[PDB]
Design a protein around this ligand. Structure first.
Ligand SMILES: C[C@H](O)[C@@H](CCOc1ccc2ccccc2c1)n1cnc(C(N)=O)c1
Ligand SMILES: [Zn+2]
Length: 349
């Protein structure tokens, strides 16, 4: 089978989109959750998509399974730990993982998410656990792992606590900020809570990535770059609809976090169309290949790779190239990027 049986780097995957179904059951059946069903095959098949959906229809999934994990300490710990594992079975050697800690919390968080009750798990505490899990999972599985904390676009009130967590826990495991969920709310890239957050990030040396351009216009991408000063774009596919912006982003070596399979499944790409990634490759962009949410997309990294291999003509040399871009564009300190990259090169020859 495997499309590209070599070392990979991955930079765009959500923790809470990367949970074993079996451990969602464990925790609902534990805590008393109630769930679309009670067998893992079923379970995947319902939080699995295989069809674009409305945003409603898509967020309701997070509504079922998140309350099995959010608020539980052994759960936060365990999903982080199990994820590292998943990724080693993918052949990843370095991953950045992102998530929102407020969306695992059930205390000093307002509004409390997921219809949860309060409870004694705070946002800060969540990231302690997660990274505990990533670390020991690093130790045992052999993947080198960092984490990215996510502001949410509809909730600029969390954004500076997001920033501060990143500073508080930086270089183990947290290496950067993200901005996530729902691009389409008007002006949200320019919400003062987000833009003071990303400026604080610049001020404190934390790395920036932003969602922009999976579902929003090229205007949102230009917001990510010019106002929030991102160093990388999550997805970025709509930047193609504005060509000076595409021209300038290709020329400041801007990194795109591509997610092929994520984008058919979501509708972000219409499948009658040049997939963004083939153009991106034709133009020699800086990009990665990425999973986004394997639970939801019924995926693995090899899924992504199979797609671009079988239907987009890609090729092991690009595969090698793009993973080398991922390593160059990682949020590691340079002494360790270079260590990442020298591993990759050796492996690639
Ligand atoms: C960032 C977190 O790690 C988490 C957030 C889950 O809850 C949400 C909440 C609101 C949203 C509104 C629009 C789009 C996605 C949303 C995801 N998450 C997981 N995957 C995604 C995604 N694919 O967009 C976002
Ligand atoms: Zn994402």
């Amino acid at each position: 089978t495997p499309a590209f049986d070599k070392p990979k780097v991955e930079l765009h995957v959500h923790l809470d989109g990367a949970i074993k179904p079996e451990t969602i059951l464990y925790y609902g059946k534990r805590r008393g959750i109630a769930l679309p069903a009670d067998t893992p095959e079923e379970l995947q098949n319902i939080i699995g998509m295989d069809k674009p959906l409305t945003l409603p229809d898509f967020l309701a999934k997070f509504d079922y399974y998140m309350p099995a994990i959010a608020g539980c300490r052994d759960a936060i710990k365990r999903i982080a730990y199990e994820f590292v594992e998943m990724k080693a079975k993918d052949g990843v050697v370095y991953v950045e993982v992102r998530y929102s800690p407020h969306l695992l919390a059930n205390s000093k968080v307002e509004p409390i998410p997921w219809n949860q009750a309060e409870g004694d798990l705070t946002p800060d505490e969540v990231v302690s656990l997660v990274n505990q899990g990533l670390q020991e999972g690093e130790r045992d599985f052999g993947v080198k792992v960092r984490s990215i904390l996510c502001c949410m676009r509809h909730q600029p009130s969390w954004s500076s606590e997001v920033v501060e967590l990143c500073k508080k826990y930086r270089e183990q495991t947290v290496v950067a900020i993200d901005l996530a969920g729902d691009e389409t709310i008007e002006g949200s890239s320019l919400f003062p809570g987000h833009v003071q957050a990303y400026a604080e990030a610049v001020k404190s040396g934390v790395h920036r990535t932003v969602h922009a351009g999976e579902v929003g216009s090229a205007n949102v991408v230009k917001e990510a770059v010019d106002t929030l000063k991102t160093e990388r774009l999550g997805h970025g596919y709509h930047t193609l609809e504005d060509t000076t912006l595409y021209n300038r982003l290709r020329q400041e070596n801007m990194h795109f976090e591509i997610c092929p399979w994520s984008s058919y499944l979501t509708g972000a790409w219409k499948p009658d169309t040049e997939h963004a990634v083939i153009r991106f490759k034709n133009d020699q962009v800086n990009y990665s290949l990425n999973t986004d949410d394997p639970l939801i997309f019924k995926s693995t990294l090899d899924t992504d790779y199979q797609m671009t291999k079988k239907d987009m003509g890609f090729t092991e040399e690009e595969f090698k190239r793009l993973n080398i871009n991922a390593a160059k564009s990682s949020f590691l300190p340079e002494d360790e990027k270079k260590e990442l990259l020298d591993l990759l090169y050796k492996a690639y020859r």
